[PDB]
Amino acid sequence: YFQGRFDNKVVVITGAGNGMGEAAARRFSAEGAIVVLADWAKEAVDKVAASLPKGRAMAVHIDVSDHVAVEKMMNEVAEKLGRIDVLLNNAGVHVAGSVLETSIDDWRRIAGVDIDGVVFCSKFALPHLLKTKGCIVNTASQSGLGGDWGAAYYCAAKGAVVNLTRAMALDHGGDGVRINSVCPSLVKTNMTNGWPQEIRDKFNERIALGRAAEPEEVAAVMAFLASDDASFINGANIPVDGGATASDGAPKI
Amino acid sequence: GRFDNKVVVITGAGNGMGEAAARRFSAEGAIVVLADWAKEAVDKVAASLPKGRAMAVHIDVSDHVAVEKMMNEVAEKLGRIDVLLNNAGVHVAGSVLETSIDDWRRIAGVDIDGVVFCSKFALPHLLKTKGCIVNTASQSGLGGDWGAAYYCAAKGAVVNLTRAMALDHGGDGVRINSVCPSLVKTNMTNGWPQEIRDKFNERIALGRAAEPEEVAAVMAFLASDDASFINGANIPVDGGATASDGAPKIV
Amino acid sequence: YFQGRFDNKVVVITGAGNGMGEAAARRFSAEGAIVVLADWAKEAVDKVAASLPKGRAMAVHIDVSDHVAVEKMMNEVAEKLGRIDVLLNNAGVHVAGSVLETSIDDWRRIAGVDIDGVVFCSKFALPHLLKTKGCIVNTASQSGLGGDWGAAYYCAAKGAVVNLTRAMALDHGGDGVRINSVCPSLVKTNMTNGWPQEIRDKFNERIALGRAAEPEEVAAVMAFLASDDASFINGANIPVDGGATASDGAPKI
Amino acid sequence: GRFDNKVVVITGAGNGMGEAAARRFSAEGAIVVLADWAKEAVDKVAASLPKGRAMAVHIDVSDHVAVEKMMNEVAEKLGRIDVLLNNAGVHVAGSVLETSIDDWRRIAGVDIDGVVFCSKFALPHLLKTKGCIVNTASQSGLGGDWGAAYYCAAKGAVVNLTRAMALDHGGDGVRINSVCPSLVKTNMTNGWPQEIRDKFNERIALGRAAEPEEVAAVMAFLASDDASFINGANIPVDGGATASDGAPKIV
Ligand SMILES: NC(=O)c1ccc[n+]([C@@H]2O[C@H](COP(=O)([O-])OP(=O)(O)OC[C@H]3O[C@@H](n4cnc5c(N)ncnc54)[C@H](O)[C@@H]3O)[C@@H](O)[C@H]2O)c1
Ligand SMILES: NC(=O)c1ccc[n+]([C@@H]2O[C@H](COP(=O)([O-])OP(=O)(O)OC[C@H]3O[C@@H](n4cnc5c(N)ncnc54)[C@H](O)[C@@H]3O)[C@@H](O)[C@H]2O)c1
Ligand code: NA
Ligand code: NA
Ligand code: NA
Ligand code: NA
């Protein structure tokens, strides 16, 4: 019933090597998209691309924090494939700590990819997206919709992405480029599967669905936000969090 | 066939977004129960859908007695309830100083009590199917209007009831979410003047009122497996309206 | 430095017998206000009133859920004292449970005082407030800014108060009546001091300040919102919660 | 004497809301440190206040080296820091397609980095006094603008940094909050045309731009003992702007 939903659409995915990035690549690919799997590292995106239909997936190296590199990537993709239809700004760096536990370097690391990456990839994709009346889906976070204990820089950066999603949706929605985010809770990885049962129980107590988000469940929302069914959704920061942000913060008794 | 043999109960199904939801869910294989107090209108919609896959209920969802009976009779007759769309709603325009106690009672009865009652009496049945609720809230539940004070109170209640019930029941397999439209082309707004409708085109970044089908599309998505990790969300379907900080355009 | 801030202003306080109501009465009284202590029960408001300066405090019986009684109370107060300057809509009923654990009666009990009380007291005070360019402070709740586990009706009612505060502030702010709320976390009572250390520790873990709100701390915000210092604050739902609603819901690790 | 002998560090203190805060805190007995990159302006404000109770620092708060030195020198010289107002800010108008990488760097440097750096290097000193932070965010950090994309990203970062740092440090006795103004009568907006300013009067329910003193009043309140249980709050000082759901007036 979703067969062909993204037939011959060009989807650029940044952070394509991470768990949400791979799940996105596979979901959009299954619905007919041509995927561009953009990431810093080579092995993960190459492996995913080689698993997808011949001629329908390509991998690129990018540092999304480098505006010159990003401009050149977006123009080459549009040149090589004739079009860009969807940008998934899914690159992400996290560092744990308060501002007293994290360095200027930690700030530059988080800000460069999590903020600058969204600004640069959106600014340089937009001329292509305007031609196709395509869209942008930002990977924001639960951590951009309110604060965390012990991730101050990360919360600042994801806060920037949530409000930039709003501002850009106002600037470009009326010219036919819808701009939205997904705000996932912590996604099931092995950088989460590796946590002790004490720690994974504390996360699950706070989520009414009582488990972590699967990456496929976040990908499903990204695909929906890029679909014609989302024609009137613009500037939205969609919580994909099992209820996490629906709480006023009071404990579950 | 996304909703093949799923029983979908839709309040306010005789017109507008409820009708559009009936047609969308019915197209995807649902059996639709169409609840409305507009008897002629909801009968016509039910009769337009595939034989044996649509039934109309003449009901005022403000009436807990009538709501409890409907949800139990539907469950008995069709053996299940999978989806509840709490969509039925009325609007009145004005500040509290320009709208009566009776106006308040009508707004609260349909827009707050209808949602509470329908949720409360559908829930035992949705728990059996790991079904879901989609509330029709509004942009006017996420923030205030000039000149719809009672409506804003009601839709405000719907937005936060969505969150609380999502925490209560999500763990037992019942997702509860809302859609929050801005202006939609329906009977609710077809009497509003061009002066006000034109300013909605300025305040909505997409530059137009929504079609009722564009909101039905999101109701279908929220009831779908692709929304399996969306719970307690008040989804704006507003073209950007609530994304604005309230400021006019800076340039 | 606050001496005289509310000199000869008439402050109507509903739920004047509860802990926030008494703390409000005392705070506004100390700054020169004439207080009207409106509540269902007699003993508490009589005791507070008798503790305050002669001629500067009166107690009334009211059911804020009764629109006829409320209209008559507001007109008699304005008639007797010549003016109303401030309305504190501080009446409150709570019942614990999901919608499956709470009855239609429980819904009518919560809705009548927590919603209807704010609508009725605001509608009937407003003609008086317009004459003095006074204001309204609603006692909303943390529970009106997001959901709780096990208080579904309460969250619906406080949600209504938070958004009604917004709508009314838009309707009346420009005519000189500012309308705001306070959104307290659970306030220290003996209906909280009576809870076991297991249960009070769970509440405190979720509040960065690591303790419950004192009623005086909520009263201080109500007085600020009614002051000339709050001249540009309108339609605001002020969290008085030690950080509770600043959290995205993630656990503290 | 609410701030008698309290050391209050105020960035952007040479003009507008920072200047108004300097005068308000100084009136209530504070010793004010006035940090600004506009040397003439901040010197004039400092010289206008009581002798021995005001000092100007010529600084670009985007520069972490300069910020760390200032906070340590202030603490050494005056023996304490009680309050930090992260107020310094710049604005640029346009979408990302109409504003340059350099524009972004200038906005991010002052509006995001300045706040991060000033907070980070003031904090050890505020922990000693159980002091507080008040950030100047904006209505444009709580929602989006048409035509201020970079500014909205920056103020968005400030709003959520306020929340995270409030959770990190509130327990150690350091409250962190923000004020979120709509239009204020300052150098920042004195170049904006009447067409845009008049529409702010429509979108602000109070019907006027704020005086800078009306925001300084709230900064003083948030640094006061009366705000002892307010933490991680982004307080709108906007006359109702963000209370709106985005809709134009219904009647
Ligand atoms: N149209 C908009 O601009 C807009 C915007 C946001 C939200 N909404 C919400 O959308 C929902 C649907 O409204 P619509 O715009 O499609 O208008 P509509 O008038 O086309 O349809 C509403 C339907 O609800 C029915 N209904 C009303 N009260 C009822 C009751 N007591 N019992 C049973 N049925 C009842 C009506 O008869 C009607 O068929 C409402 O909850 C409304 O508040 C409307
Ligand atoms: N004026 C408004 O409408 C409005 C609305 C909401 C928020 N704000 C915020 O209010 C704050 C104060 O701005 P204002 O309106 O009073 O404008 P202003 O121009 O009157 O004052 C801002 C001051 O900050 C100083 N400053 C700027 N960059 C600096 C830097 N790198 N280092 C040190 N000092 C620096 C400037 O020299 C100036 O003195 C800003 O953060 C602004 O974003 C303004
Ligand atoms: Na998760
Ligand atoms: Na109509
Ligand atoms: Na508390
Ligand atoms: Na200027």
Numbering used by the authors:
A (entry chain B), C (entry chain B): -2 to 250
B (entry chain A), D (entry chain A): 1 to 251
Give the original sentences from the paper that presented this experimental model.
SmBdh exhibits the typical single domain short-chain dehydrogenase/reductase (SDR) architecture.
As with the WT SmBdh, the primary difference between the two molecules in the asymmetric unit in the mutant structures was that molecule A was found in ‘closed’ conformation (that could be best described by ~ 10 Å distance between Cα-atoms of residues Ala93 and Trp192) and molecule B was found in ‘open’ conformation (the corresponding distance is ~ 15 Å). Upon examination of the electron density maps, we were able to locate NAD + cofactor molecule and a substrate in protein molecule A (‘closed’ conformation), whereas in molecule B (‘open’ conformation) the corresponding space is occupied by only adenine diphosphate (as in Q247A mutant) or remains unoccupied (as in Q247A + V139Q mutant) at all. In the Q247A + V139Q double mutant structure, an ethylene glycol molecule was modeled at the substrate-binding pocket. We suggest that the available space in the substrate binding site became reduced compared to the Q247A single mutant, thereby providing insufficient space for glycerol to fit. Instead, ethylene glycol which is comparable in size to acetoin could fit. Although the double mutant did not completely restore the loss of Gln247 activity, significant function was regained by introducing the V139Q mutation in this protein.
